[PDB]
A paper describes a structure:
Eps15-homology domain containing proteins (EHDs) are eukaryotic, dynamin-related ATPases involved in cellular membrane trafficking. EHDs harbor a dynamin-related GTPase (G-) domain that binds to adenine rather than guanine nucleotides. EHDs tubulate negatively-charged liposomes in an ATP-dependent manner by the formation of ring-shaped and helical filaments on the remodeled membranes. EHD4/Pincher mediates macropinocytosis required for retrograde endosomal Trk signaling.
In the present work, we reconstitute an N-terminally truncated EHD4 variant on tubular membrane templates and determine these structures by cryo-electron tomography (cryo-ET) and subtomogram averaging (STA). Accordingly, our in vitro reconstitutions were done in the presence of the nonhydrolysable ATP analogue, adenylyl-imidodiphosphate (AMPPNP). The resulting cryo-electron microscopy (cryo-EM) density map had an average resolution of 7.6 Å and 8.5 Å, as determined by FSC and FSC-independent analyses, respectively. EHD4 formed right-handed helical filaments wrapping around the lipid tubes. The EH domains are located furthest from the membrane, the G-domains at the center and the helical domains closest to the membrane. As in the previously reported crystal structures, dimerization of EHD4 is mediated by helix α6 in the G-domain. Interface-2 is formed between the helical domain of one protomer and the G-domain of the adjacent protomer along the filament. Interface-3 is formed between G-domains of two adjacent dimers across the filament and corresponds to the archetypal G-interface that is conserved in all members of the dynamin family. Membrane-bound EHD4 adopted the closed conformation of the helical domain, akin to the reported EHD2 conformation. Thus, helices α8 and α9 in the helical domain engage with the membrane bilayer by inserting hydrophobic residues at the connecting loop into the membrane outer leaflet.
Author numbering:
A (entry chain A), B (entry chain I), C (entry chain J): 22 to 535
Write the structure that this text describes.
C-alpha cells in the first residue's frame, strides 16, 4: 500500500462515479488511468524541426538511444517515449498505449496515425530508473492545417501538458522560427504555464549581436503568442557535448545551463506530489461541472417548454455560475470558460441530464478534507523513495576522474611536465607501451593507470583532468583508445598547452564516437 | 498455442462473423486468411524495369536464386516470392496462392494472368528462415492503360501494402523515370505511407552534379505524385557487390546503406506485432463500417418511399458519419472516405441490409479491451522466437575473415611484405604450391592456410583482409581458385599496393562468378 | 527619337485608348507609365529576413550603400531602390513614386505605408549606370495575415514581377525557412516564372550532408509551393566576400556563382527587348479583354430582362471565350483565368459596357504587324547602347592586379622568396619603408610599387596576387595600409605559405573594413 496506490484507489473508487454520471469525460477530459499514478516523473520535450531535441536528451543521458538517432535533419517523425527497460530495445505505440506500467493508455482515443507515429525506447539507465522523456516530433514550420495530420496534435499536447512533470520548449538561434503550429500548440498548453521552460539552444555558434537579437525576435513573437504578460523564464545556452564555438557569453551559457539542470534535479521529490496536485485540480473542476449540470437539470422542466427553456438557460448560464459560486463558496478560478461551456451545451439534450446527488459532492468534500490528510504522513514517509534524477555529467566531466581529485595545489601534486613518451604520440607505439604496462583484457586497470601516469610527475589536478577527458565510456578504467587519448593530452602538456575542458569529437576515438 | 495462433483464432472466431454479415468483404477488403498470420515478416520490392531489384535481393542474400536471374534488361516478367525452401527449386503461382504455409491464398481473386505472372522461389538460406521477399515486375514506363494488363496491378499492390512488413521503392539514377503506372501504384499504396522506403540506386556511376539533380528531378516529381507534404526518407547509394565507380560520395552512400540495412534488421521483433497492428486497423474499420450499415438499415423504411429515402440518405451520409462519431466515441481517422462510400452505396439495395446486432459490436470492443490484453504476455514471452533477419555481408566482407582479426597493430602482427611466391602468381604454379601444402579434397583447411600464410610475415589485419577477399563461397576454407586469389593479393602487396575493400568480378574466379 | 521613345509613344497614343474605354485598368493592370519604358534594366531581390540580400547586393557592387546597411539581423524594414545617382545620397518613397526618370509612378496606388516603407538609394557606380536593384524587405516568417501589413505585398510584388528584368529568390541554409508569406508571394509571381532564379546562400558554413538535405527540405517544400512541375534552376553557393568555411563543395559553389553571374551579365542587350516583350504581352491580353467586353455588351439587352440575362451570361462565359477564340483566331494562352473573370464580372453593371469599336482592334493588329516591324531596325541599331552591366569582381579579384599579369612561368618571373623586410612586418616599420620609398600624398604610385616589389624577386604571378589582395580600394595605387598588407603577404611567402585567394576581413585593414 503505497501513496500512489492510495491516490489511484481513491480516484477509481469515488472520483470516477461522478465523472461517469455527469459525463465530465465528454466535456473537459476523459476518465483517468492507473497510468497517470503508476508513471514515473516525466519530462516532455517539444520544439520545431532541426532544433536538436535528440541532442538534448542524449546530452542529458550520456548514452545513445535504441530507437532515436541524432540528426540536424528532421528525423523525429514519431513521438519517442524513452523509458527504463530491463533490456536495450524499443516497442511501438499501439503496444505502448496499452502497457500496464506506462503512462499512456489514455492515448488510445486519438488512435491510428498518432499511435503509428508514437514509439517507445526501453533502455537501462540511471536517469531512466528516475524519469521518462517524451521527445516530440519537430513542430512543423510549413504553415500546415490541422486536418492534414492524421491526429490532433493540439489535443494530444494538451493531454500531455495536463500530466507532464516538466515541459521544455526548445528554440534554436540558427534556424529561429515561430510557427502557427507551435502557436496553436501553446494555446493547447494553456492552463499549465508553470511547467513550460523556454530554452534557447545553439547560442554559441552565432555572434553577440546575432544572439542578442535572435533572442529578441523570438521573444517579441513569444510575448504576443503566449498572450500572458507574465514573464517566462528563459535558458540561453548550448546544451552540447562539444567545445564552444564563440566564448563571448560562456559564463551566461553555463549559468543558464546549471539553473535549468538544477530545476530538473528538483523533480524526484516532486514526483508523487504533483500527482496529488493534478488530483486536486481535476477534483475541483469535476465538482464545479457537477454543480453546473445539477443546476441545469433542476432548471429543466418536465416535458413542455423545453426548447424555450433551454434557449433561455444557455444565455442565462453566467449568472447561474455566479449563483453557484455564491451558494457553494467555490473559487472563481475553478470554473471552466463560459463560452466553451456554451458551445458544448447546445449539443446536449437537457432532458437526459442527471439530478443533483448530494452523496457524491459530500464525499468529494470529505476526500479533500480527510483522505489527502491521511495520505500526508505516507507522503512524508515516502519522500525519499527516489530522490535521484539529476542532470548528470558526461564522458568529459569532473566526475569521470574517479580516483582523482579535481583541482588543488599539493606537493604530492607535481610539476607541469616531467615525463611522457615523446614520439609514441602515434597509435601503434601508444599500444606498444599500453601492453608493456600489462593490461587486463586489453584494458589498463584504474590503479595501474594511476601508478603509471603519476610517474609522469604532473600535478594531480591536471592528471585527473587527463583521466576525465580520456575515459569516454566512464567505467573508471582505460581502454586502448582512451589510454592513447590520455597520453596524447600528457604529451601536449609536455609541449606546453592548456587542457580543453571538454574534448571535441575530433579528439574522441573514432570507435567511441556516435 | 502461439500468439500467432491466438490472433488467427480470435479473427476467425469473432471478426469474420460481422465481416460476412455486413459484407465488409464487398466494400474495403475481403475476408482474411490464415496466411496473413502464419506468414513470416516480408519485404516487398517494387521499382520500374531495369532498376536492378534482382541485384538488390541477391546482394542482400549473398546467393543466387532458383528462379530469378539478374539482368540490366527487364527479366522480371512475373512476381517472385522468394522464401525458405527445404530444397532448392521453385513453385508456380496458382500453387503458391493456395499453399497452407504461404501468405497468398487471398490472391486467388485476381486469378488467371496474375497467377501465371506470379512465381515462388524456394531455397534454404539464413535470411530466408527469417523473411520472404517479393520481387515485383518492373513497373512499366510505356504509358500503358490499366486494361491492357491481364490483372489489376494497383489492386494487387494495395493488397500487399495492407500486409507487407517493408515496401521498398527502388529508383535508379541512370534510367531515372517516374511513370504513370508507378503513380497510380503509389495511390494504391495510399494508407500505408509508413512502410515505403525510397532508395536511389546507381548513385556512384554518375557525376556529383548529375547525381544531385537526378535526385532532384525524381523528388520534385515525387513531391507532387505522393501529394503528402510529409518528407519520405530516402536512401542514396549503390547496393552493389562491385567496387565503386566514382568515390566522391562514398561516405554518403555507405551511411545511407547502413541506415537502410539497420532499419531492415529491426523487423524480426517487429514481425508478430505488426500482425496485431493490422488486426487492430481492420477491427476499427470493420466496426465503423458496421455502424454505418446499421444506421442505414434502421433509416431504411419498411416498403414504401424506398427510392426517395435512399436518394436522400446517400446525400445525408456525411452528417450520418458525424452522428455516429458523436454517439459512439470513435475517432474520425477510423472512417473510410465519404465519396468512395457514396459510389459504393448506390450499387446496393437498401432493403437487404442487416439491422444492428449489439452482440458483435460488444464482443469486438471486448476483444480490443481484453483479448489483446491477454495476448500481450504471450508476445513478451515470444519476443525472441526469431530475432535474426539482418542484412548480412557478402563474399567480400569483414566477417568472411573467420579465424582472423579485422584491424589492429600487434607485434604478433607483422611487416607489410616479407614472403610470397613471386612468379607463381600464375594459376598453374599457384596450384603447384597449393598441392605441396597438402590440401584435403582439393581444399586447404582453415588452420593449414593460417599456418602457411602467417609465414608470409604480413600484418594479421591485412592477412584477414586477404582471407575475406579470397574466400568467395564463405565456408571458412580455401579452394584452388580462392587460394590463388588470396596469394595473388599477397604478391600484389609484396609489389606494393593497397588491398581493395571489395573485389571486382574481374578478380573473382571465373567459376565463382555469377 | 529612341526605340524606347517609340515604344512609349505608340503605347500612350493607341494602347491607352482601349485600356481606358474597356477599363482594363479595373480588371488586370492599371494604365502604364512612361517609367516602365524610360527605366533601366532592373534586378529585384527577394528573400526572407536574415537571408543576406544586402550582402548579395554589396558583393555585386564592391561598394557600400548610402541608405542600406548589411546585417545578419533584419534591417531591411523598407524596399531599397538602389540606382545611379550623380551624388551619394538617398531619396524617400513618395518622392520616388513620382520621379520622372524612375520606374515607380504606378506604385502610388498602394500609397501610405508602402511609400513610407519604400526608399531609394542614389549613388554613382559603373554597375548603376547599367542597372537598378530593388532590395525587398525580408519576407516575414511569423505567420502573419495580409491585413496586418499597411500595404498589399502580394499585389506590389506582382506589379514588380510584371516589369522586372530578373527576380532573384534568396534562401539561406543556416536559417532555412519556407513561409506562408513567401508562398502567397510566389502565387503573386505566377505568370512570370521565367524571371525567377532560386539561389541557396551560405552553403559553405554547413557540412556536406547538412547542405544536401537543407537543399532537400527547401525544394520538397518548393515543389508543392510553386505547383508547377517544371524544374526551376537553382544556384547553390556562397556569394560572400570572405574566405570559404568548408571547402568540400567549393567547385560547385563557384560553378553556380559563375553561371548566375553570366546570366545576370546577359541582361544589357536584354533591356529594351523585354520592354517590347511586356508590350506584346499586355497588348494581347488587352485585346482579348476587349473582345470579351464587346461580346458581353452586344449580348446585353436594351432595358428588360437585364438581371436574368446577366445571370445567364456569367455562367455562359466559358463558351463565349471558345466562340471568341474560334472567330478571332487568338491563342488560348492569351485569355485570363475564367473564374477570376467570373468574380470580377458580377461587380459590374452590364448596361454601362461599351460596344465593339473595330477601329481600336484593327489599329492594334496594325501595331503588331507593322510598328514593331518598323522598330526592329532601330532595336538592331541600338543593340549596343549599353552592353556592360556585368557581375564585377571585388577588392580581391584577379583584375585588381592592374599592371600585373595573372598566372604564368616566365624567367622574367622570379623565385618564391628572395627579398622583403623581415621584422618590418609590423605597422610602424612598414610605414618607415613606405616613406623611404617616397610616396605621393601618402600613396605609393603603381609604377613605384612595381619597381620596389619586383626587387623582391618573387614570380610576377604571385606579385600580381599580392597586389590584387592588398589593393582594397581598387584605384590601382597603394596606400599605407594596403602597402602594409601587401608586404605582409610578401613576408608570409618568405616564411613559406600559400597566398589566400580572397583575403579575410581580419587581414583587411581596419579602416578599409565595412
Amino acid at each position: 500500500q503505497t501513496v500512489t496506490g492510495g491516490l489511484r484507489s481513491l480516484y477509481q473508487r469515488k472520483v470516477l462515479p461522478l465523472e461517469e454520471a455527469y459525463r465530465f469525460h465528454e466535456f473537459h477530459s476523459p476518465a483517468l488511468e492507473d497510468a497517470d499514478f503508476e508513471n514515473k516523473p516525466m519530462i516532455l520535450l517539444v520544439g520545431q524541426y532541426s532544433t536538436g531535441k535528440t541532442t538534448f536528451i542524449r546530452y542529458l543521458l550520456e548514452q545513445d538511444f535504441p530507437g532515436m538517432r541524432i540528426g540536424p535533419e528532421p528525423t523525429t517523425d514519431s513521438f519517442i517515449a524513452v523509458m527504463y527497460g530491463e533490456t536495450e530495445g524499443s516497442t511501438p505505440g499501439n503496444a505502448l498505449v496499452v502497457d500496464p506500467k506506462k503512462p499512456f493508455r489514455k492515448l488510445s482515443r486519438f488512435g491510428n496515425a498518432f499511435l503509428n507515429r508514437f514509439m517507445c525506447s526501453q533502455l537501462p539507465n540511471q536517469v531512466l530508473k528516475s524519469i521518462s522523456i517524451i521527445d516530440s516530433p519537430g513542430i512543423l514550420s510549413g504553415e500546415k492545417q490541422r486536418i492534414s495530420r492524421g491526429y490532433d496534435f493540439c489535443q494530444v499536447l494538451q493531454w500531455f501538458a495536463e500530466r507532464v512533470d516538466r515541459i521544455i520548449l526548445l528554440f534554436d538561434a540558427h534556424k529561429l522560427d515561430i510557427s502557427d503550429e507551435f502557436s496553436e500548440a501553446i494555446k493547447a498548453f494553456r492552463g499549465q504555464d508553470d511547467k513550460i521552460r523556454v530554452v534557447l539552444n545553439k547560442a554559441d555558434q552565432v555572434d553577440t549581436q546575432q544572439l542578442m537579437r535572435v533572442y529578441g525576435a523570438l521573444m517579441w513573437s513569444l510575448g504576443k503568442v503566449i498572450n500572458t504578460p507574465e514573464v517566462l523564464r528563459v535558458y540561453i545556452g548550448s546544451f552540447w557535448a562539444q567545445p564552444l564555438q564563440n566564448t563571448d557569453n560562456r559564463r551566461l551559457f553555463e549559468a543558464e545551463a546549471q539553473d535549468l539542470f538544477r530545476d530538473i534535479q528538483s523533480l524526484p521529490q516532486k514526483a508523487a506530489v504533483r500527482k496529488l496536485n493534478d488530483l486536486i485540480k481535476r477534483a475541483r473542476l469535476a465538482k464545479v461541472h457537477a454543480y453546473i449540470i445539477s443546476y441545469l437539470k433542476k432548471e429543466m422542466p418536465n416535458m413542455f417548454g423545453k426548447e424555450n427553456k433551454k434557449r433561455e438557460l444557455i444565455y442565462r448560464l453566467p449568472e447561474i455560475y455566479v449563483q453557484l459560486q455564491r451558494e457553494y463558496q467555490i473559487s472563481a478560478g475553478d470554473f471552466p470558460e463560459v463560452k466553451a461551456m456554451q458551445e458544448q451545451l447546445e449539443n446536449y439534450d437537457f432532458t437526459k441530464f442527471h439530478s443533483l446527488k448530494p452523496k457524491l459532492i459530500e464525499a468529494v468534500d470529505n476526500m479533500l478534507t480527510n483522505k489527502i490528510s491521511s495520505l500526508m504522513g505516507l507522503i512524508s514517509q515516502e519522500e525519499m523513495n527516489m530522490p535521484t534524477q539529476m542532470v548528470q555529467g558526461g564522458a568529459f566531466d569532473g566526475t569521470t576522474e574517479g580516483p582523482f581529485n579535481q583541482g588543488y595545489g599539493e606537493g604530492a601534486k607535481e610539476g607541469a611536465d616531467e615525463e611522457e613518451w615523446v614520439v609514441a604520440k602515434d597509435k601503434p607505439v601508444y599500444d606498444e607501451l599500453f601492453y608493456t604496462l600489462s593490461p587486463i583484457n586489453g584494458k589498463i586497470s584504474g590503479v595501474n593507470a594511476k601508478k603509471e601516469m603519476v610517474t609522469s610527475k604532473l600535478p594531480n589536478s591536471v592528471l585527473g583532468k587527463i583521466w576525465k577527458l580520456a575515459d569516454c565510456d566512464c567505467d573508471g578504467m582505460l581502454d586502448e583508445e582512451e589510454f592513447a587519448l590520455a597520453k596524447h593530452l600528457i604529451k601536449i602538456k609536455l609541449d606546453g598547452y592548456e587542457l580543453p575542458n571538454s574534448l571535441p569529437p575530433h579528439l574522441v576515438p573514432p570507435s567511441h564516437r556516435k
